[PDB]
């Protein structure tokens, strides 16, 4: 199977949409336990898939920042600015129509992403 | 890739959700051209997944009937009653409750499904 059971496949990745709510760091610890990360949204097409599937509640994704800084990926590098992220918060999430930001201690649903099983990067 | 580009993978199948609208027979022709069929919805659970992604438009699916007669999948097997397909029409589609039906010449979006390329 390209993706784990109950994950959703889309363009060489596998996505998990949570049932539970957790804070941002706890959501990342959950994704890390599944050999994945909080969604690393790398194109506008991926964004659109996520907004369409997720349904009505806010979902954490894997971008964080410091107040006067750029948004960073989980690996600590500045991200590629595929879409605007609104608000004045430290952790990013998806809402009804796009990406916004809030404090990392708030409990939200989350999305994990990883590569499908047939992807090689060598 | 398990699925062709932009199809959504779920539980060893791939699903195509159209952006365009067609009548039911031409929708099944599109699906067949991409080595698939109009979605042969297998169960209430598969239903809940298609309902999650499809968004507000009506989408044709792979069941139809002759007047009076039981619903049949594209493959010829009679529907197994995991949920009702409502209405008075010959051709089935998904609204946001579950399945409803209409005249086959009208214009709706559609969903295709097929087994992913690693099934065997
Ligand atoms: C996040 O939530 C956990 C319980 O899930 C709590 O123990 C932790 O202190 C909270 N905040 C952070 C930043 O870990
Ligand atoms: C860091 O993570 C991002 C998001 O997946 C990836 O696109 C980028 O190539 C990675 N950068 C490094 C230096 O590993
Ligand atoms: C017809 O398709 C349905 C829905 O997936 C499946 O349950 C049934 O086994 C199929 N019959 C054959 C012969 O493919
Ligand atoms: C359905 O549409 C196709 C064109 O894609 C056409 O050949 C066919 O006549 C239409 N069927 C009906 C009943 O209007």
UniProtKB/Swiss-Prot annotation, chain B:
Topology feature Extracellular, residues: 1-119
Chain ranges of the C-type lectin domain: 10-113
Recorded GO CC terms: cell surface; endoplasmic reticulum; external side of plasma membrane; membrane; plasma membrane
SS bond partners: 3-14, 31-112
Keywords per UniProt: Cell membrane, Disulfide bond, Endoplasmic reticulum, Glycoprotein, Lectin, Membrane, Receptor, Signal-anchor, Transmembrane, Transmembrane helix
Residues bearing glycans: 23, 75
Summary of the tissues where the protein is detected: Detected in peripheral blood leukocytes, osteoblasts, lymph node, thymus and spleen. Isoform 1, isoform 2 and isoform 4 are expressed in T- and B-lymphocytes, and at lower levels in NK cells. They are also expressed in B-cell lines and LPS-matured monocyte-derived dendritic cells.
Record localization: Cell membrane
Predominant location category: membrane
Annotated membrane topology: Single-pass type II membrane protein
Induction notes from the record: Up-regulated by IL1A/interleukin-1 alpha and prostaglandin E2 in cultured osteogenic sarcoma cells.
Function recorded in the entry: Receptor for KLRB1 that protects target cells against natural killer cell-mediated lysis. Inhibits osteoclast formation. Inhibits bone resorption. Modulates the release of interferon-gamma. Binds high molecular weight sulfated glycosaminoglycans.
Name of this protein: C-type lectin domain family 2 member D
Gene designation per UniProt: CLEC2D
Interval of the full protein contained in this chain: 73 to 191 of 191
